[PDB]
Write a protein that binds this ligand. Sequence first.
Ligand SMILES: Cc1cc2nc3c(=O)[nH]c(=O)nc-3n(C[C@H](O)[C@H](O)[C@H](O)COP(=O)(O)OP(=O)(O)OC[C@H]3O[C@@H](n4cnc5c(N)ncnc54)[C@H](O)[C@@H]3O)c2cc1C
Ligand SMILES: O=C(O)[C@H]1C[C@H](O)CN1
Ligand SMILES: O=C(O)[C@H]1C[C@H](O)CN1
Length: 1214
Amino acid sequence: APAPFADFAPPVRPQSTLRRAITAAYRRPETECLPPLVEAATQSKEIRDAAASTARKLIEALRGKGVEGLVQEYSLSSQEGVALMCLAEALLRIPDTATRDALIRDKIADGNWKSHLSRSLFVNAATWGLVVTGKLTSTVNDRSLAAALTRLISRCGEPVIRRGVDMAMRMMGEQFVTGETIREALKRSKELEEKGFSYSYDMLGEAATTAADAERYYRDYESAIHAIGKASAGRGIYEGPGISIKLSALHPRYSRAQAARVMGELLPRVKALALLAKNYDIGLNIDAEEADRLELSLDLLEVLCLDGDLSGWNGMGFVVQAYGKRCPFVLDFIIDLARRSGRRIMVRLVKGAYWDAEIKRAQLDGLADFPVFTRKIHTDVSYIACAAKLLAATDVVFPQFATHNAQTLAAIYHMAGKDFHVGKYEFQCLHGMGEPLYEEVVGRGKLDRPCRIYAPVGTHETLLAYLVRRLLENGANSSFVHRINDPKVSIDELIADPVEVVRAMPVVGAKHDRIALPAELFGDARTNSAGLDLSNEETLASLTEALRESAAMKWTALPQLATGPAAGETRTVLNPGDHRDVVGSVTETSEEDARRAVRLAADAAPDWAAVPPSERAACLDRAAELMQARMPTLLGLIIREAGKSALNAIAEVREAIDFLRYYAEQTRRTLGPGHGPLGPIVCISPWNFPLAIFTGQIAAALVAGNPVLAKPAEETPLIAAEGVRILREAGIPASALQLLPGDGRVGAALVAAAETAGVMFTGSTEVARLIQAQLADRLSPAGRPIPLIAETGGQNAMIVDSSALAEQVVGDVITSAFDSAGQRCSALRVLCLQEDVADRILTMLKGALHELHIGRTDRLSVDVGPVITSEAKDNIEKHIERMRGLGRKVEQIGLASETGVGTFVPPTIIELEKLSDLQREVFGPVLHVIRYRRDDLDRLVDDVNATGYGLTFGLHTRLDETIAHVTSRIKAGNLYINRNIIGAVVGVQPFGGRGLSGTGPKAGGPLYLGRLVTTAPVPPQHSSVHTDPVLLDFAKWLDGKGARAEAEAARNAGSSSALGLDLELPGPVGERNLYTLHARGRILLVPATESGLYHQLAAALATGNSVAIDAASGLQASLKNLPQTVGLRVSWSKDWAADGPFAGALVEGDAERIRAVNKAIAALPGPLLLVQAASSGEIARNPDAYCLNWLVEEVSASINTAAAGGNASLMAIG
Ligand SMILES: Cc1cc2nc3c(=O)[nH]c(=O)nc-3n(C[C@H](O)[C@H](O)[C@H](O)COP(=O)(O)OP(=O)(O)OC[C@H]3O[C@@H](n4cnc5c(N)ncnc54)[C@H](O)[C@@H]3O)c2cc1C
Ligand SMILES: O=C(O)[C@H]1C[C@H](O)CN1
Ligand SMILES: O=C(O)[C@H]1C[C@H](O)CN1
């Protein structure tokens, strides 16, 4: 039995002093990075004057010497220009020229283009939008583009189509790429090579998703090296052409978490390519990618440069990104490696291509700081400082200064001084972008310095995949190329010296004012939880030790009553990934002690309610600080007791911290003396989030003033006991928080106890239904139903159309379906693929499936851990085998023999014919896949809704018409557009669904605390200026019947309702997080009196709902001659079970009537109804007898606005 965490994340090699200096700088404060860069980049006044003169001369030449001319000739609007280029792109998908010209002449020009051109014409319109307008719009208004295309064709005919086709052909064949193939690119390179330029070819591959993809990119690089080497014809690595590669293209799991596979499988591939480049004597450059891949790539560079089989060749090259805080330290490492190996490493200094993605990622992950600068001028100073370091080492490395910025260029030209020879250093630029500048540099008649052109090579499909990111390199508001084209920017502005500008700022190196540190994402409202960087070797080393220490601890969980720990039956808790690993011991609660616990909580209820809300919130904030400090140890317990990966354990502890701080802040915003506690609340928590949901339910109940009986899942008591220890240490009294470990007998006794005043349950729908039936037997002392918040499963779908990017889809599907072994309630269960792209995406999905590592989760390399119990495993496998036996196609990964000691299910893909083939939630790593025809999209949405669930839902599309259609018709609580569907963030995507998925209100949202008090407060931001029009028609009808008081109450309900609330919640960059209040659906009305019915109807209509009114009330004659608008919303029900599903209920009657109706409602099949009851007298006395908070439905929508390849808002931040 391997020792826990003994092999968690060992580094590829011991970290040298130089390597440790790199890691130390990963997230160094920006104010600390800049001063040494300013010093290194300083030059004499004479040089600064000379450089500014050279920069001015270059800029004057640039300003002194396609799409815009076409837009001008045909008087096109922006949208017409975009639509025309999309049409041209589509016409170029037609291979035969004569067939294309005939279609243009005979079909496209004369009328309907739609009739002749499964795939929207406008799939890539975000890219063409950048080309035409210079602005990035993340999604495509395809109806606007269709209108514009019809308009321009009907106005201008074939001539404009011809001009568009020829323009797109030139751009996609000669500007965005040097050529479609390496042979074509090589042919076109001779012209500028004769003028003194050189070339490095970029084959445009990246981000392999499957082994087959990586093999394809490998053979593409190999064939390109042959073509380039044959063409080089012995010119060598400086005069002759080279190749550039991306490591992410060569392996589907290129990450620090998979470092062993990277060194074992990726390294030999790079070696084989490098050996071929050595034989032809050409350059081979390793491009730089995301920040979390930098240090891993150094391990490959180290091995290759030390490998004697590559000796004698100086063509190995490596990019370093000056926007990165580690850049000078990376350069120190590379220069030393060059000295040790004797290889003259070609070092390409760039600024960096992934800036906005790095900002978003650091924010999402809650890390200490960014790994890149946040002010553009800081990157500029960094670049010049790093150029000074490189120019001092030209005997051991070959510096390659890639930049289009004439000020940067001039500074380095003068820094390098007067002595020059080919091979000392060079500049570099991008094909079809940097030549105007560098034609003022190359040649004896200019500055006599060489320039290497980075030349993309590929087909239209390949070049369009990441063209947005490339366009943003030179197209943002702070980009030199954008500014030189802006006439409002003077040459004096362009030649400003960033080194001296930074030196003179008040605070040198200050973070950009408009970019929030991850900790400050929520500003003054609350402090964001902090995560851990699993790509940082210092973090991995310290975590390894903390995790090992956590596994040596004798974890226990006991019945912790108000009076002290109680005795009980004691058993061990075993690691689900390896039952030989005993995690701890649990003593379970007797039924007698559970009943005693409720009585003790009732006795203590006044003393806890008397603790002022601000002080209760302070306990929660203290507990959050304690959990943050304890995170490494908490990770270890979650990993071993609950079977989670480290990554998911971090996110869970973060969620617990976020719940504590969110409910504390919401309390500080709302709770006062009139919002009295319910009383003792029984909190029943699940094993799949045994810290986060455990903590969230309990923290909310406590901070609202209620003592808590905490019943954790039988499988996961240890983390629960630790959460209770932390809450008590933070100041929660033992009488206010009692822990009752055990099985369902304990939960049942707690629910049934007469003093239990409310229940918070997260778990299965079937158990929630049993709890509901027990609670319906009771009323509060006030004679009202006992509140139940019951959050249950989902049958969560994702719809993918032909405009989505397959690589993005597959990554989001693999994560959503198989993360946490599919044991998230949010997990993706049914993937729906548009028929035209289904086979391609399915092939990629199956290939990605087989790259997952399944095993015991005390290793960083494990992607999917065990399921929670043998019973869970057996249930899941029985489903898989039933599907297999029905002839459905089943794909499964093979499991290692080491899995036999635990309870594992392999990630599995099952292809179904129709959604209805799936009849039950399968709570494991099992993705079902269906296909749909585009015209059947609306029926498919019906099929998704038809399950009766409504928790999470995903949509991958670029098309606004499809977003509008699908999001308006889907009925789910948590929507996700162009991203995964898991990991809802407290206060950002408030979490919870409808129908069979939950009662609400949403956890991590602003209505939650109000359900835990007898009189609900007004939540922050909770209002709406919109009045339901059927409500208004009803109020007029009441006035016409003479029911003046009820008409006034109806108008007041119309105003009080928050239906229509539509907010954007603060969160990370590159995402829009929306929170909206809608109608719930059809509310069951059980009135007793005419006035009661009018009040019930007013409340339901003001919140946008329809109603079914109990026909047994005998009140039909009270609703004669309704306006048709109101009649459309009103039905009468004799058989309530036949007329559902309902989305809530309002009941009028005395206590006995309320109890009988509540029991009848619990018997209705389908969703658990949120029931509100009042007596006739309460309706007369209290305008809020029926609270409108519970008659609306919350919807969260999270849209990934960076999905098109970059962040439009961040293009303005420099
Ligand atoms: C030949 C060549 C090879 C390249 N190879 C790579 C590669 O392997 N890896 C890679 O990542 N990119 C690569 N690049 C791209 C390069 O990193 C730049 O993104 C791009 O060339 C524009 O920078 P600049 O010096 O041309 O112009 P500039 O307008 O001077 O600089 C723009 C750059 O400033 C930086 N920046 C913008 N805003 C901010 C901000 N608010 N805070 C901090 N920094 C900011 C960004 O890095 C941005 O790209 C390459 C570029 C060329 C020409
Ligand atoms: O569970 C317990 O009893 C304690 C002991 C150690 O501190 C880990 N938690
Ligand atoms: O899995 C998720 O999406 C979130 C929702 C719940 O709070 C548990 N974690």
